[PDB]
Design an enzyme around this catalytic site. Structure first.
Site, PDB file in Angstrom:
ATOM      1  CB  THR G   1      -0.929   0.027   1.218  1.00 37.40           C
ATOM      2  OG1 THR G   1      -1.863  -1.041   1.052  1.00 37.40           O
ATOM      3  CG2 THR G   1      -1.727   1.341   1.314  1.00 37.40           C
ATOM      4  CG  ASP G  17      -1.716   1.240  -3.753  1.00 40.33           C
ATOM      5  OD1 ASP G  17      -1.868   1.630  -2.576  1.00 40.33           O
ATOM      6  OD2 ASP G  17      -1.552   0.039  -4.058  1.00 40.33           O
ATOM      7  NE  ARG G  19      -0.798  -4.967  -6.866  1.00 39.02           N
ATOM      8  CZ  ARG G  19       0.336  -5.233  -7.510  1.00 39.02           C
ATOM      9  NH1 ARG G  19       1.455  -5.480  -6.837  1.00 39.02           N
ATOM     10  NH2 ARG G  19       0.353  -5.250  -8.837  1.00 39.02           N
ATOM     11  CE  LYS G  33      -4.814   0.128  -1.304  1.00 41.61           C
ATOM     12  NZ  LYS G  33      -3.380  -0.251  -1.241  1.00 41.61           N
ATOM     13  N   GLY G  47      -2.717  -0.860   6.026  1.00 40.69           N
ATOM     14  CA  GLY G  47      -2.701  -1.922   7.028  1.00 40.69           C
ATOM     15  C   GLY G  47      -3.833  -2.906   6.814  1.00 40.69           C
ATOM     16  CB  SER G 129       4.341  -2.060   1.823  1.00 40.83           C
ATOM     17  OG  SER G 129       3.350  -1.957   0.816  1.00 40.83           O
ATOM     18  CG  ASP G 166       5.480  -1.729  -1.983  1.00 45.20           C
ATOM     19  OD1 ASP G 166       6.141  -2.687  -1.525  1.00 45.20           O
ATOM     20  OD2 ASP G 166       4.354  -1.408  -1.542  1.00 45.20           O
ATOM     21  CB  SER G 169       1.898  -0.198  -3.959  1.00 42.40           C
ATOM     22  OG  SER G 169       2.180   0.001  -2.586  1.00 42.40           O
TER      23      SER G 169
HETATM   24  B1  LIG Z   1      -1.973  -2.030   2.085  1.00 38.69           B
HETATM   25  O1  LIG Z   1      -1.077  -3.108   1.784  1.00 38.69           O
HETATM   26  O2  LIG Z   1      -1.650  -1.489   3.376  1.00 38.69           O
HETATM   27  C1  LIG Z   1      -3.428  -2.530   2.071  1.00 38.69           C
HETATM   28  C2  LIG Z   1      -4.339  -1.384   2.452  1.00 38.69           C
HETATM   29  C3  LIG Z   1      -5.784  -1.909   2.607  1.00 38.69           C
HETATM   30  C4  LIG Z   1      -6.641  -0.797   3.236  1.00 38.69           C
HETATM   31  C5  LIG Z   1      -6.378  -2.360   1.257  1.00 38.69           C
HETATM   32  N1  LIG Z   1      -3.589  -3.668   2.986  1.00 38.69           N
HETATM   33  C6  LIG Z   1      -3.835  -4.898   2.514  1.00 38.69           C
HETATM   34  O3  LIG Z   1      -3.948  -5.174   1.321  1.00 38.69           O
HETATM   35  C7  LIG Z   1      -3.991  -5.986   3.565  1.00 38.69           C
HETATM   36  C8  LIG Z   1      -2.659  -6.675   3.750  1.00 38.69           C
HETATM   37  C9  LIG Z   1      -2.801  -7.571   4.829  1.00 38.69           C
HETATM   38  C10 LIG Z   1      -2.757  -8.954   4.622  1.00 38.69           C
HETATM   39  C11 LIG Z   1      -2.893  -9.835   5.694  1.00 38.69           C
HETATM   40  C12 LIG Z   1      -3.071  -9.344   6.984  1.00 38.69           C
HETATM   41  C13 LIG Z   1      -3.112  -7.969   7.199  1.00 38.69           C
HETATM   42  C14 LIG Z   1      -2.973  -7.089   6.129  1.00 38.69           C
HETATM   43  N2  LIG Z   1      -5.011  -6.913   3.057  1.00 38.69           N
HETATM   44  C15 LIG Z   1      -6.166  -7.129   3.712  1.00 38.69           C
HETATM   45  O4  LIG Z   1      -6.462  -6.605   4.786  1.00 38.69           O
HETATM   46  C16 LIG Z   1      -7.049  -8.008   3.090  1.00 38.69           C
HETATM   47  C17 LIG Z   1      -6.624  -9.274   2.684  1.00 38.69           C
HETATM   48  N3  LIG Z   1      -7.522 -10.148   2.057  1.00 38.69           N
HETATM   49  C18 LIG Z   1      -8.847  -9.739   1.847  1.00 38.69           C
HETATM   50  C19 LIG Z   1      -9.247  -8.472   2.264  1.00 38.69           C
HETATM   51  N4  LIG Z   1      -8.321  -7.621   2.886  1.00 38.69           N
HETATM   52 MG   LIG Z   2       2.684  -8.212 -11.207  1.00 46.83          MG
END
Ligand SMILES: *[B]([O])([O])[C]([C][C]([C])[C])[N]C(=O)[C]([C]C1=[C][C]=[C][C]=[C]1)[N]C(=O)C1=[C]N=[C][C]=N1
Ligand SMILES: [Mg+2]
Ligand SMILES: *[B]([O])([O])[C]([C][C]([C])[C])[N]C(=O)[C]([C]C1=[C][C]=[C][C]=[C]1)[N]C(=O)C1=[C]N=[C][C]=N1
Ligand SMILES: *[B]([O])([O])[C]([C][C]([C])[C])[N]C(=O)[C]([C]C1=[C][C]=[C][C]=[C]1)[N]C(=O)C1=[C]N=[C][C]=N1
Ligand SMILES: *[B]([O])([O])[C]([C][C]([C])[C])[N]C(=O)[C]([C]C1=[C][C]=[C][C]=[C]1)[N]C(=O)C1=[C]N=[C][C]=N1
Ligand SMILES: [Cl-]
Ligand SMILES: [Cl-]
Ligand SMILES: [Mg+2]
Ligand SMILES: [Mg+2]
Ligand SMILES: [Mg+2]
Ligand SMILES: [Mg+2]
Ligand SMILES: [Mg+2]
Lengths: 196, 222, 204, 195, 211, 233, 226, 195, 196
Positions: G1, G17, G19, G33, G47, G129, G166, G169
């Protein structure tokens, strides 16, 4: 983190670096670690940023409520409120705080509150990871009843060395002067203090 | 504590034709959430019309390939410039891998070429030397994304002939090199979309009786 | 040990032209042991369809919970709940167990009765909403399903074409997963007719 | 406890449960009945950790008997199985969960059909023609998958059960001291005194 | 994995599935778990593919030099013992093997179970792998010494099917072998998907499954 | 197996049209203590190669001695030691890569991350990375430690792919490197203001710059930042 | 992210972003986001996705009730205070890392919030990240007295740095501009530099390809009359 | 492996060893002979970890057979038992010890006396009138302490052994699949084919 | 432990405290941490007493053998022998050593060898647990080409502070002066250096 508070003839001066770190990454290079809990009672913060902010906010609330009922609190009273929070919640907190304030009756006063929650009233105090490297320098160079200009130089030189040797310390040197005249904020940049 | 292993990501794909074979792999090299290189070759021409790729821990993959290329060199010296057949190379590679049974090469290896009848051949290896000949095989990070697609589009799995309703299967008609490369590109484009360690570029090595040819295609760089 | 992979199973949903499709496998297992080949993972509350993967006790529990909540919704609102609204209810209900969560991977599918717009959504075990335009995947073969859907899917498919696409995505993903299979069901959903089809697949 | 089996035939449900109770290296009993009658046409067998098993079974029994008295009506096997599942799904997120797996065999007098439900300690419920808990099914399912018909008689179900038990007695390392067998049908619950 | 083998009147039947697993992911469905040591000797593979493959191919090479030295084919007992002593050196080191050595020698048909723990057992019937527990039910109930080659081949095939159906880590296809005093005979690769439906219809079994 | 004691942080580098640039600061840290301020972490090998090293300094000094001995050994019975049979960047790298992988395979690594920058006989640019695990890779830009996270993104804006190398001049490339070193001084807690920079050009040869400093820093905006949210004074 | 915040002349801009990942897998390619706490107070979150959504909706709900109670437009410092005290109470277990920005009667504001409850003030900020890749851009190109157009460019360039460099992201860039005396403009998918190329082949199947056992109509309608 | 018993009577030594071999939840064999003839009048039964047991037993067998050929003379049971003990006492401080417990039953033709030796994996040797390894003795020693006389006949020893086995079959949780029984006397070693 | 070596106009001076501890117990209060490996090459020892003694003994042996064959070794050579031992046996050693010596050609030289086994040639060096507290003081007060009297005062003041703040440091301050004139031992007692 490198923080210090020094009493002098006209009152007290607080000093601090501006670096916040997550491991070796500098999360903020322009941090303000000198925080106000009352008009002429300030504190220096070290340790957990969340813990020290949460504490200082609660203290500012207590002293604001104290003032509404009993008038201006003493620096000792402010230090006692800090202590009560740091001592009673010692298991869950990581906070090293220096409390400094100016009365007209008591003049400049400095209280340091390390990890355990103990209180120590001192002529001057140093704290934070970077303080370790300047115990010798500060002990050799500190005098009582210094002038404002002498005290500013003492803090500037001291924190300059603390920053030089400690990776967790850096950025600008912030200072806050507490006297009868009022509250003055000072700032000193790398190009100035590195060449000392 | 020192961890002697790592993960450099990457994904590879080997498909065997009727008189050809392809070995494809992405060109991205990574550690954790960082990109090391957007173009770091992973599939190699090892000589004797054999192509090879050892995917996983790059340092172990580079060492294995380096040792197999060396094994081919000494096979010529010791046996009068005899051509190393794909089945003989595969067996040799098992012994390279099992020589470190108690401190493995942390790689999934695939080789491709032609068998002694001129037909396309792909061989697949686990890190400790178990190998087998295959028609279609993906290895590495996004292997689980790609293989089910190849089961469906190369071996026509779960596909039946309309009108019969599950009674008669779809006949196993052979694929051309142009049809195979389309499936390779679509496999990696799809894997790039859903796998973070896949992207940047795609390098394909095609093996025929005429020799070894290369083709390169860009992939998404995010 | 991992709650999300003890029982196994998969769910996939797709949008089409004025239609949606949701499909699931029928396996319920105890790790390596296959227990039931009739454990359907797709439920419906009016015209809103909900697929749930993960720990089977929680699948059953949440179904009973959303039946409970949607029945009360209908009595008070005097109308059936819509997919967009139900999606928010699922999210709310999962996040209320933030630090003691249901080990599930829900998937919503349905068509808004007023706008006629096809709708799908996916969730993590704690309520995060993934409102996709194309497809949603869930289960022990989610990696496999991502690969199949991302290559086979194309937008604006007709119901009878969408059926073939989602079926092939499920079947071939299930056949690369040890903890999925033992039968499969596909729901084809239109604004005022829903067809349910059981697929013939390998039983190993 | 160890082995509990269940098979639903044409007109009845048959439950077979091991007789042994073990504490360490010693067999305390060789004639233990791992079952409680919940209602006249509903029987529940059980297996799991010591104490939990009997405490849970008798707790369920008391609740169903209370319902029966209050309404002067026997709950359907399906309703009972759902009540049991909810109690176990409630239990699994409690401070100390009941470590109990159960089989519920009942005859629905309304539908005139036998019904068998398998429920594990997590609250995982499944209706089956035949089922088992623990390591039991590993040995017996291949025989049941082969020989089972839904139109089987009670006598044919018992013969297939003997075959399942014979296989257990050959390949299981643990001696479970035979099984107590009970049949649930339209006329109620009875025990096969010779097996 | 499900592998089995049993002695009978007309030799020994050897059957095995073809699934290889990596966690929940199915890596392969075309694995040869039966190894051709020599035309009169077979070896099964279960557990570690690499371990079983390497040590049994090293065995075949041991058995070959035995023949050159002694002008005689090695016995099943001697072959199984060489393997057992080879793997015993690496006991506790982490090897994972569950194998059967099947053949016909001067003592008639022979069948030995050998594993990485150190067991070496002669027996008329064995089944090893995660799905062995399902296979034993079908074997023990239908196994006789007076079995025809046709019926014996079906029994080994039906037993693998029983395990492939229930065990999540067993499946793919069935490989059959018949070992005679004139050597082993391969009896083909049988897809479980197609085989299941066929057996369901012809036998009537698996009524619980809908087809 | 060991742990690193006295350490060096990021080494950064990139290719440009006629050669390569590499840089690294002059600090030897002792945990959070910024102990040694005069440590050279760029080590030239001949007039065509510069090896930049991060990680454990004792292991760096060992590698430095291996390279010094390599030059001595190459000159033995070699009349063309200062010509056709001089040490190439590719030779020097492969030697180190061999040593690194062998040491990790004995579970006693050289706790370093190394970038070998240079120009080959035929004028081709050489830039390759190797670390304690024996892992190797090449890219138009390369950086170790924190540089990988902060410097690479900036340097990749100049040279995003292979075709951007001929379009990139030495002035532009040096400007990008110097900017990256400033950013690392802002954000890396184990970095120093003082650094060394080396350019290996196929025309002008090896230029080694010492005692460089990060300059043109932005700090003035700090005076306007007060408190952590609500505080106004 | 990758999420960023950049102040400018007459306001503040945030970006992110799109993702979402689970391990090495992408769960959503076009995730949103950027969250709305109030009409002119927006927040970017990194997060745990459910946590940033939940904590934002909760504080936004309480901010709305507060605004109605006081007959005043909500302030950023209120949202800031309510968020940090909530997160501090849960001692980091609520994995929400936020960049909070907005305009109110006091002026324009930009803050960051960490999961343990610490806040920071700045003219430019970055979280997630890809924050290091983004911060490298911000430290290289940020200056005092930026215009609105310059700040949007700087913010999106910072997100792009994260997108490209990254692995956590990717996909698209979302922006929200909050200018003093104006309506906040939410620019969903401001940039789209990652459209998938056309596939080489169509995988549409012949009808009747899949084997079927049973068919049946599902009754979704209620119980009927007569 | 599981249960190995031994009893020395008036004119012979009787060894009873379980037939079962187990790998996890499965009984691989139910007719395993856990014994090796070391010499014509010396028999050794054994139990312990898989592989170690047979490897050690056959190693001892080869050494005693080698001694017999070299000297054209049979070692006394006492001499054999001492050789075995030294090999185990040597083994216990090695890199990987043999995890094997043994009973050595022999008839000394010089003294015209049967002799039974119990030796565990540590190299702990004891001469006994009756002995057992593992959890066996826990169930059987009370019966042997009660019924044993040194002037017992071989038939009386077998009857007391049946009683010991009957108690094991009742109170042991594990099914060991009966025992193979062997008698060592002046005329050599023979197996009781019906037990 | 507080140890330091400082170069000056006429050569080099080594300095050290005299405290050895087992936890908080002072096992020896009159320790000699300044040890001789050659006539005018000495070292300061910190870390494990056993390790540093075993090393210094081996080095003294190597340099004695060097001298018998090749004549007087340089200070750099002595530092190299220390390094070779400390680096190659880094996994099993806990030794922080400062090497100091006087040549007529090279004059006063100081090499510091921290835990890893790296070597650093410096104008002056500080080491030991107590050195942390005087990084600032020493950096501010050190000058090159000081006189003997100035250098003695610099070390005395520096170690005085290190002792004051570090519990692992204490006792007497020992010093060893290395010049062309010869080798002079100095000692300074608590009553003298505490009042500074
Ligand atoms: B980013 O990487 O911070 C992003 C921001 C979020 C608001 C979309 N976070 C994630 O993509 C997180 C990463 C993560 C994975 C595992 C544990 C904690 C955090 N993903 C999720 O929270 C997620 C994963 N699968 C389905 C839905 N959400
Ligand atoms: Mg790729
Ligand atoms: B200083 O280092 O003590 C500093 C003072 C703080 C009040 C701004 N603390 C931090 O930088 C802490 C970590 C730490 C470093 C060194 C010693 C003690 C503590 N950092 C944080 O609390 C932090 C870091 N990143 C995000 C949020 N909070
Ligand atoms: B079987 O399940 O034992 C099987 C036999 C092998 C010869 C192919 N083993 C495996 O599938 C193992 C995992 C395993 C599963 C169940 C029990 C024991 C072991 N996997 C592999 O050997 C393997 C090899 N290469 C790639 C992936 N997996
Ligand atoms: B000093 O503290 O480093 C000192 C110098 C030593 C060479 C005389 N070392 C010690 O006192 C060590 C322990 C220690 C304390 C503080 C930092 C590092 C090490 N003590 C011993 O080695 C020792 C203690 N008691 C008996 C024998 N040796
Ligand atoms: Cl702060
Ligand atoms: Cl000492
Ligand atoms: Mg600093
Ligand atoms: Mg499956
Ligand atoms: Mg169950
Ligand atoms: Mg299966
Ligand atoms: Mg299965």
């Amino acid at each position: 983190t490198s923080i210090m508070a020094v009493t002098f003839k006209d009152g007290v001066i607080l000093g601090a670096d501006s670096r916040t770190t997550t491991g070796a990454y500098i999360a903020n290079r322009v941090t303000d670690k000198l925080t106000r809990v009352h008009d002429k009672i300030w504190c220096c913060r070290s340790g957990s940023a969340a813990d020290t902010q949460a504490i200082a906010d609660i203290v500012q609330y207590h002293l604001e409520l104290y003032t509404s009922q009993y008038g201006t609190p003493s620096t000792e009273t402010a230090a006692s409120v800090f202590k009560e929070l740091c001592y009673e919640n010692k298991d869950n907190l990581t906070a090293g705080i220096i409390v400094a304030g100016y009365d007209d009756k008591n003049k400049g006063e400095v209280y340091t509150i390390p990890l355990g929650g103990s209180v120590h009233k001192l002529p001057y105090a140093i704290a934070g990871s970077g303080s370790t490297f300047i115990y010798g320098y500060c002990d050799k160079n500190f005098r009582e009843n210094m002038s404002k200009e002498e005290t500013v130089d003492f803090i500037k030189h001291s924190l300059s060395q603390a920053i030089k040797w400690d990776g967790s310390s850096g950025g600008v040197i912030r200072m806050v002067v507490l006297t009868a005249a009022g509250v003055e904020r000072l700032i000193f940049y790398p190009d100035e203090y590195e060449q000392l | 504590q020192f961890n002697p292993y790592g993960d450099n990501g990457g994904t590879i794909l080997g498909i065997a034709g009727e008189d050809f074979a392809v070995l494809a792999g992405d060109t991205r090299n990574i550690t954790d959430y960082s990109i090391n290189s957007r173009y770091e070759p992973k599939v190699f021409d090892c000589g004797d019309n054999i192509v090879m790729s050892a995917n996983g821990f790059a340092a172990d993959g580079d060492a294995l390939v380096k040792r197999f290329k060396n094994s081919v060199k000494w096979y010529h010296f010791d046996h009068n410039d005899k051509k190393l057949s794909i089945n003989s190379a595969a067996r040799n590679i098992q012994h390279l891998l099992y020589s470190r049974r108690f401190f493995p090469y942390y790689v999934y290896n695939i080789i491709a070429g032609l068998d002694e009848d001129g037909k396309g051949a792909v061989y697949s290896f686990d890190p400790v030397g178990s190998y087998q000949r295959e028609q279609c095989r993906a290895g590495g990070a996004a292997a689980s994304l790609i293989m089910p697609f190849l089961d469906n589009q190369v071996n026509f799995k779960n596909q039946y002939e309309p009108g019969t309703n599950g009674k008669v299967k779809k006949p196993l008609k052979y694929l051309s090199v142009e049809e195979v490369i389309k499936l390779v590109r679509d496999s990696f484009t799809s894997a790039t979309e859903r796998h973070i360690q896949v992207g940047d570029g795609l390098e394909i090595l095609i093996v025929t009786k005429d020799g070894v040819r290369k083709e390169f295609y860009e992939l998404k760089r995010d | 040990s991992d709650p999300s992979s003890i029982n196994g199973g998969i769910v996939v949903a797709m949008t089409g032209k004025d239609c949606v499709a949701i499909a699931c496998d029928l396996r319920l297992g105890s790790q390596s042991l296959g227990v039931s080949n009739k454990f359907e993972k797709i439920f419906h509350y009016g015209h809103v369809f909900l697929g749930i993967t993960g720990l089977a006790t929680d699948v059953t529990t949440l179904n009973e919970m959303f039946r409970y909540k949607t029945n009360l919704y209908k009595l008070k609102e005097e109308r059936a709940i819509e997919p967009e609204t139900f999606t928010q209810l699922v999210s709310s209900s999962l996040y209320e167990r933030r630090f003691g969560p249901y080990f599930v991977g829900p998937v919503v599918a349905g068509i808004n009765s007023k706008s006629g717009k096809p709708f799908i959504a996916g969730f993590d075990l704690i309520g995060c909403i993934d409102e996709a335009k194309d497809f949603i995947v869930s289960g022990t073969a989610s990696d496999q399903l991502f690969g199949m859907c991302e290559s086979l899917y194309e937008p604006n498919l007709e119901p009878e074409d969408l059926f073939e696409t989602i079926s092939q995505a499920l079947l071939n993903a299930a056949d690369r997963d040890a903890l999925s299979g033992w039968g499969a069901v596909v729901y084809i959903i239109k604004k005022d007719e829903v067809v349910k089809r059981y697929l013939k697949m390998r039983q190993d | 406890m160890d082995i509990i089996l269940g098979i639903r035939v044409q007109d009845s449900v048959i439950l077979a449960s091991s007789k042994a109770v073990t504490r360490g290296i010693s067999v305390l009993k060789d004639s233990d009945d791992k079952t409680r009658q919940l209602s006249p046409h509903t029987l529940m067998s059980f297996a799991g950790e010591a104490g939990d098993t009997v405490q849970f079974a008798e707790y369920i029994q008391a609740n169903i008997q209370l319902y029966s008295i209050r309404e002067d009506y026997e709950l359907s096997p399906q309703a009972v199985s759902s009540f049991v599942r909810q109690e176990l799904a409630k239990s699994i997120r409690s401070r100390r969960p009941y470590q109990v797996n159960v089989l519920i065999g009942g005859y629905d007098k309304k539908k005139n059909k036998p019904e068998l439900y398998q429920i594990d300690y997590l609250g995982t419920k499944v209706e089956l023609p035949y089922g088992a808990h623990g390591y039991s099914g590993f040995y017996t399912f291949s025989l049941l998958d082969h020989h089972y018909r839904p139109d089987m008689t009670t006598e044919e179900g018992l013969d297939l059960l003997k075959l399942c038990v014979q296989e257990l007695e050959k390949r299981m390392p643990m001696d479970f001291k035979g099984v107590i067998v009970k049949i649930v049908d339209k006329d109620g619950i009875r025990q096969v005194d010779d097996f | 994995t499900t592998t089995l083998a049993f002695k009978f009147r007309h030799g020994v039947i050897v059957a095995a599935d073809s699934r290889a697993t990596a966690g929940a992911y199915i890596a392969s469905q075309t694995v040869k778990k039966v190894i051709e040591i020599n035309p009169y000797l077979l070896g099964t593979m279960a557990g570690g593919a690499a371990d079983c493959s390497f040590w049994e191919r090293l065995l075949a090479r041991q058995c070959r030099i035995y023949e050159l030295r002694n002008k005689e084919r090695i016995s099943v007992a001697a072959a199984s013992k060489l393997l057992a002593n080879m793997v015993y050196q690496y006991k506790g080191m982490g090897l994972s093997m569950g194998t059967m050595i099947c053949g016909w020698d001067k003592r008639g048909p022979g069948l030995y179970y050998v594993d990485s723990e150190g067991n070496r057992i002669s027996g008329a019937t064995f089944s090893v792998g995660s799905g062995s527990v399902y296979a034993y039910g079908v074997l023990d109930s239908n196994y006789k010494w007076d079995l025809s080659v046709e019926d014996a081949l079906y029994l080994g095939k039906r037993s693998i099917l029983a395990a492939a159906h229930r065990d999540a880590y067993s499946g793919g296809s069935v490989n059959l072998y018949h070992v005679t005093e004139d050597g082993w005979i391969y009896h083909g690769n049988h897809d479980v998907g197609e085989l299941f439906w066929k057996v369901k219809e012809e036998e009537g079994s698996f009524n619980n499954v809908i087809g | 197996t060991q742990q690193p004691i006295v350490t060096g942080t990021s080494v950064i580098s990139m290719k440009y049209d006629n050669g390569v640039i590499i840089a690294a600061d002059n600090l030897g840290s002792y945990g959070s203590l910024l102990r040694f301020n005069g440590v050279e972490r760029l080590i030239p090998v001949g007039d065509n190669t510069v090896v930049g090293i991060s990680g454990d300094i004792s292991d760096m000094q060992h590698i430095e001695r291996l390279l010094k001995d390599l030059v001595t050994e190459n000159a033995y019975d070699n009349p063309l030691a200062d010509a056709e049979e001089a040490l190439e960047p590719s030779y020097i790298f492969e030697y180190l890569a061999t040593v690194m992988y062998q040491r990790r395979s004995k579970m006693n690594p050289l706790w370093n991350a190394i970038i070998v920058a240079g120009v080959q006989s035929n004028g081709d640019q050489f830039l390759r990375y190797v670390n304690l695990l024996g892992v190797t890779y090449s890219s138009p830009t390369l950086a170790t430690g924190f540089g990988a996270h902060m410097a690479n993104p900036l340097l990749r804006k100049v040279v995003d792919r292979e075709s951007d190398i001929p379009k990139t001049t030495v002035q532009v490339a040096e400007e990008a490197i110097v900017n990256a070193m400033r950013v690392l001084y802002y954000r890396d807690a184990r970095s120093s203001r003082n650094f060394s920079l080396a350019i290996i050009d196929k025309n002008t040869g090896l230029t080694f710059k010492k005692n460089l400093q990060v300059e043109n820093m932005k700090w003035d905006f700090a005076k306007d930042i007060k408190g952590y949210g609500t505080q106004k004074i | 992210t990758t999420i960023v915040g950049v102040k400018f002349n007459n306001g503040v801009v945030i970006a992110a972003d799109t993702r979402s990942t689970q391990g090495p897998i992408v769960a959503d390619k076009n995730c949103a986001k950027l969250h709305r706490i109030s009409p002119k107070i927006w927040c970017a979150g990194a997060g745990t996705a459910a946590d940033t959504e939940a904590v934002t909706q909760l504080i936004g709900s309480n901010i709305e009730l507060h605004s109605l109670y006081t007959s005043r437009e909500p302030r950023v410092v209120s949202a800031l205070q309510m968020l940090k005290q909530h997160l501090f109470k849960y001692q980091g277990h609520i994995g929400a890392y936020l960049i909070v920005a907005g305009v109110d009667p006091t002026g324009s504001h930009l803050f960051s919030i960490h999961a343990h409850g610490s806040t920071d003030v700045g003219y430019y900020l970055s979280l997630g990240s890809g924050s290091l890749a983004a911060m490298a851009v911000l430290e290289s190109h940020w200056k005092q007295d930026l215009t609105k157009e310059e700040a949007i460019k700087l913010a999106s360039d910072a997100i792009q740095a994260g997108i490209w460099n990254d692995l956590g992201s990717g996909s698209n860039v979302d922006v929200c501009v909050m200018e003093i005396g104006k309506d906040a403009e939410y620019l969903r998918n401001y940039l789209t530099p990652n459209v998938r190329e056309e596939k080489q082949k169509s995988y549409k199947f012949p009808r009747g390809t899949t084997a079927v056992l049973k068919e049946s109509i599902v009754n979704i309608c209620d119980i009927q009359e007569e």
